[PDB]
Amino acid sequence: SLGPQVAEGENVFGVCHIFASFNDTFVHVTDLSGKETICRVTGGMKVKADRDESSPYAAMLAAQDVAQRCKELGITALHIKLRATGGNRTKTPGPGAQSALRALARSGMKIGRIEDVTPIPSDSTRRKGGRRGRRL
RNA sequence: GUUCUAUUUUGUUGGUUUUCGGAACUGAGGCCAUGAUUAAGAGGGACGGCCGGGGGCAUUCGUAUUGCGCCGCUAGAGGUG
CATH number of the domain that residue A101 is part of: 3.30.420.80
Give the Cα separation of A10 and A87 in Å (integer): 38
The rounded distance, in Å, linking the Cα atoms of A20 and A54 is 8
Contacts of strand B, CB cut-off 7 Å? A 21-24, 26, 28, 30, 35-37, 39-40, 42-45, 50-51, 53, 86-88, 119-125, 136
Domain encompassing residue A85: 1-136
Say if CB A43 and CB A55 are below 8 A apart: yes
Query: b/e map of A50-68 (b: 16 or more CB within 10 Å)?
Result: eebbbbbebbbbbbebbbe
Resolution (angstroms) stands at 3.1
Which residues, in sequence order, are CB contacts of A37 under 8 Å at separation 6+?
A: A28, A29, A30, A31
Report the residue count for chain A.
136
Residue type, A114: I
Gyration radius of chain A's alpha carbons: 17
Separation of A92 CA and B6 C1' (Å)? 122
Q: What values do phi and psi take at A104, rounded to 5?
A: -70, -35
Q: How many domains does chain A contain in total?
A: 1
Report the C-alpha gap between A83 and A99 in whole angstroms: 14
